[PDB]
């Protein structure tokens, strides 16, 4: 596959809402398919990545080695950029953290409807 596939365009950035500068640090990956009937190399990568259970949240760094590994298993995973509206959680708030489906990890859970 040509490298142009992984070279983004200005329109692509708008569609996916990703800024070319300050790229997202952490990837959110969940397995949505089975590795049965797949070649051994595909099976090995999934086990190494820890995505044994489907729909299992995993925190991984957006680094070339992880990026290379994720590309191999791209079709079996969903990639979402992590967002920290309130910043990194503190030690005291480590028990109050909650990750939303939108990709935002709130450090304080107030048990109030967003509405």
């Amino acid at each position: 596959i040509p490298d142009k596939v992984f070279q983004p365009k200005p329109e692509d950035h708008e569609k996916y809402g990703g800024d070319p500068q300050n790229p997202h640090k952490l990837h959110i990956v969940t397995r949505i398919r089975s590795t049965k009937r797949r070649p051994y190399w595909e099976k090995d990568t999934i086990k190494m990545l820890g995505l044994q259970k489907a729909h299992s949240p995993q925190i991984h760094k957006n680094i070339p080695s992880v990026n290379a590994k994720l590309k191999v298993v791209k079709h079996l995973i969903r990639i979402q950029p992590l967002k920290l509206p309130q910043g990194l959680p503190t030690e005291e708030t480590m028990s109050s953290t909650c990750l939303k489906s939108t990709g935002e990890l709130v450090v304080q859970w107030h048990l109030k409807p967003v509405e």
Partner: peptide, 27 residues
Amino acid sequence: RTVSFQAKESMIRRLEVEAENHYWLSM
């Protein structure tokens, strides 16, 4: 075996999702 309309949409969605994976792996 003629392809059902539902099947075509499902395949398109998988390709579209994979395209998003490409972009987030491009940075």
